[PDB]
């Protein structure tokens, strides 16, 4: 989420599917958006 | 007389010790100043002693400059009182003036004596080779002392001699395993060296300031030679001087400005040699051409900002880069010596004595670490050198510089995949051109999709050696008057020479179209020599069949010439990308290169609006201020890339 963050596109639902598919772990869409707001907070990377 | 004046020279009084020193040792190193007489007088003394004697062997004197080899051999014709061509010769690239049995001492240049290895490796004709000006460190000189280190076990009777500058001569003796250094300290008219006490901000202004400090106050007759970096900082100093010369009053005497550099035309380079008349002062601006090449009479005062301009071949991407650097202490002391040519002279240096000791370097750059090594690896491999890292050379090329030259011979087909030099690779040693250029001539004859066009590829290849010094002024002004349909920078060269030929080689035609006539003489001499060596290999005979047996004289000619220059130059192709043109190599990525302002592809992309061709072949990737491209060639069809060089482009396309 952070490494690509500086030049990201508008579609968060396609990025939500790429992470969920290349890792083979199924996440609820409402559960994933909790962490997207947690990752929006993080300052140093 | 002349015999009376030879005793005046410094090396003559050291002669009687010097002969026993040569007869005892094998390799001797002479540490002498410029003007000591070690060039002229030394091989004369061996003939007077009877060195060559009854024997067939003759002395060779090697100099780096072709112009200096002819001019020194005129002096020895005067001193030994024999006409030039017999008993005193010179053998240079174009004007062999020798007798094969009556000429004793021949003053050939440095590139010549490497070529005699290619036929005869042991040098059976020579008893005493004297390298001269070995501190120049040309590419031909470093290989020549690298190969003559191996020949000394095979011949114990050959004498070798080296004339060198002072600071460089220590490093030579350790290379030849501590052979003795002889010394002749002959110096004429010493120079007083003036400094600035504090570092300056903008040296061009302080240069203009210091000329007026010499002009308004100092004694006459006095001339000024300044050393600017390149062309572009001479015209800016030429223009800013012309304003202030007029604005100053009518009482001050006239000042003349006469720029010199290599690419400036011959008609203006003769203006320095004219003696300036009374009541006027000659100021000369110059690049490096003043310090070593030629002699301007009357130069008392020399202003030296201390900057040279040098090119470092970056071997990964394969590009030269040409930057401004602070020059070494060796080249500064050569610049001050141009002052004391006639009488005592001043030398003004725009820097401090603290910076001159602690910031500047001793030796500038060995030229073999700089330049491209694709030509000499094939020279070494044909002389049976199996091991190149362990080759006993003075200053090693870096391993990427030496790796890139081994892939580049493998692409062209010179080296077999087992490492053996092939049939084609033996020809490239013979031709007097690069290994890239001699494959262009080879697919111009034999290759089945490019036959018959060898009569035109000799014309272009001859023109590409002289592309800096063709046009007087801007190119497109001279390009448009010749013809108006050229879309590539190569086909203009085929057309300018063909119309200069049908004008029966006129001098007056060149001044009509703003082309340097002296350069076109040199292109004609290069063309005739490439035509001899293509007869002698036999490419001319296989050429002429493919025009008679297959008639092709239409507009397919300029599509076969394009096909030949891909097989010769296959790493040099770019591709049109989003920013601009990008280099198409597999190891080197896109460098976002831009067409140079001189080229015909720059006129057609800005002054007109031709849509850019998707691939462009270039001849030279250099970066002065930006990664540029020179001598471009439009490739229209993409499938010419796969068909001509499939060993690279079957992958990348």
């Amino acid at each position: 989420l952070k490494e690509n963050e500086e030049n990201e596109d508008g579609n968060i639902e396609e990025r939500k599917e790429k992470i969920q598919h290349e890792l083979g772990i199924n996440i609820d869409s409402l559960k994933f958006n909790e962490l997207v707001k947690l990752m929006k907070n993080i300052t140093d990377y | 007389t002349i015999q009376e004046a030879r005793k005046l020279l410094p090396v003559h009084q050291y002669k009687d010790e010097l002969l026993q020193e040569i007869k005892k040792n094998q390799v001797l190193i002479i540490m002498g100043e410029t003007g000591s007489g070690k060039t002229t007088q030394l091989p004369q003394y061996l003939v007077e002693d009877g060195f060559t004697d009854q024997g067939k062997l003759q002395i060779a004197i090697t100099q780096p400059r072709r112009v200096a080899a002819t001019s020194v051999a005129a002096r020895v014709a005067d001193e030994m009182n024999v006409v030039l061509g017999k008993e005193v010769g010179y053998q240079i690239r174009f004007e062999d003036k020798t007798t094969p049995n009556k000429t004793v001492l021949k003053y050939m240049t440095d590139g010549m004596l490497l070529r005699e290895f290619l036929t005869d490796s042991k040098l059976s004709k020579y008893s005493c080779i004297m390298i001269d000006e070995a501190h120049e460190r040309t590419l031909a000189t470093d290989i020549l002392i690298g190969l003559l280190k191996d020949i000394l076990p095979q011949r114990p009777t050959l004498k070798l001699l080296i004339s060198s500058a002072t600071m460089n001569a220590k490093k030579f003796s350790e290379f030849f395993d501590n052979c003795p250094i002889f010394n002749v300290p002959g110096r004429r008219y010493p120079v007083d060296i003036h400094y600035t006490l504090q570092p300056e901000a903008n040296y061009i202004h302080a240069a203009i300031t210091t000329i007026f400090q010499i002009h308004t106050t100092q004694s006459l007759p006095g001339d000024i030679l300044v050393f600017l970096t390149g062309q572009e900082e001479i015209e800016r100093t030429k223009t800013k001087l012309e304003e202030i010369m007029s604005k100053l009053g009518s009482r001050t005497k006239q000042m003349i400005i006469t720029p010199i550099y290599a690419n400036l035309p011959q008609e203006q380079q003769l203006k320095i040699f004219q003696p300036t008349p009374e009541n006027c002062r000659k100021v000369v601006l110059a690049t490096n051409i003043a310090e070593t090449s030629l002699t301007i009479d009357g130069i008392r005062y020399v202003i030296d900002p201390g900057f040279v301009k040098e090119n470092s071949y970056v071997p990964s991407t394969g590009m030269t880069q040409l930057l401004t650097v602070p020059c070494s202490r060796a080249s500064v002391d050569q610049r001050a010596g141009r002052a004391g040519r006639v009488g005592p002279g001043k030398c003004f240096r725009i820097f401090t004595k603290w910076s001159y000791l602690h910031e500047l370097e001793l030796m500038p750059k060995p030229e073999i670490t700089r330049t491209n090594l694709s030509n000499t690896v094939l020279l070494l491999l044909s002389l049976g050198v199996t091991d190149l890292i362990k080759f006993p050379l003075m200053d090693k090329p870096s391993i990427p510089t030496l790796r890139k030259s081994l892939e580049n011979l493998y692409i062209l087909g010179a080296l077999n995949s087992k490492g053996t030099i092939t049939r084609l690779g033996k020809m490239m040693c013979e031709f007097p051109c690069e290994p890239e250029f001699a494959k262009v001539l080879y697919t111009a004859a034999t290759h089945e999709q490019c036959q018959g066009v060898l009569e035109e590829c000799l014309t272009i290849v001859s023109m590409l050696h002289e592309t800096p010094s063709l046009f007087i002024g801007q190119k497109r002004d001279a390009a448009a008057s010749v013809l108006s349909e050229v879309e590539s920078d190569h086909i203009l060269y085929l057309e300018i020479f063909n119309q200069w030929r049908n004008s029966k080689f006129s001098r007056s035609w060149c001044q009509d179209h703003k082309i340097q006539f002296k350069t076109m003489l040199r292109v004609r001499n290069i063309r005739n020599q490439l035509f001899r060596c293509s007869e002698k290999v036999g490419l001319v005979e296989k050429n002429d069949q493919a025009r008679m047996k297959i008639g092709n004289i239409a507009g397919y000619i300029n599509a076969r010439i394009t096909r030949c220059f891909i097989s010769g130059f296959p790493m040099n192709i770019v591709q049109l990308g989003p920013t601009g043109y990008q280099t198409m190599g597999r190891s080197s990525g896109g460098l976002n290169v831009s067409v140079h302002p001189t080229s015909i592809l720059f006129v057609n992309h800005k002054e007109k609006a031709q849509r850019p061709s998707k691939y462009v072949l270039y001849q030279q990737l250099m970066l002065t201020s930006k990664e540029f491209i020179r001598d471009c060639l439009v490739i229209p069809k993409e499938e010419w890339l796969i068909d001509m060089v499939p060993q690279i482009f079957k992958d990348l396309i």
Partner: protein
């Protein structure tokens, strides 16, 4: 030789190119040279109409050429953002909405350079 025949021609090309999508760039390639010599030479009603014709052709082009012309198109649009003319404003909007879909134009270049001036005009 007349200018209002030259302007009505360029509006017709932008109509034909938009009804043709995604096809036909072989046909439309022969007109790209006179449109860019009109864009660099001119101002006003010829500039805004020639730019509109070129802007509708960008979608029919191939990636390599679509990125090269879009880069040339964005320098004119940034030079001409202040313009009060309705005919030029309507061309800026057409070029923005086509050149958004080109992969050369990054999301970060739009946020720093283009979008703070789009929303204030």
């Amino acid at each position: 030789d007349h200018v209002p025949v030259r302007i009505v021609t360029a509006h017709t090309l932008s109509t034909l190119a938009e009804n043709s999508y995604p096809y036909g760039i072989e046909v439309f390639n022969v007109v790209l040279e006179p449109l860019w010599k009109g864009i660099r030479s001119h101002r006003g009603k010829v500039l805004s109409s020639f730019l509109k014709a070129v802007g509708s052709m960008i979608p029919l082009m191939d990636p390599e050429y679509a990125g090269y012309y879009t880069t040339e198109a964005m320098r004119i649009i940034r030079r001409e953002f202040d313009s009060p003319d309705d005919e030029m404003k309507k061309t800026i909007l057409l070029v923005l909405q086509k050149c958004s879909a080109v992969e050369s134009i990054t999301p970060k270049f739009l946020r720093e350079e283009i979008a703070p001036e789009f929303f204030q005009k």
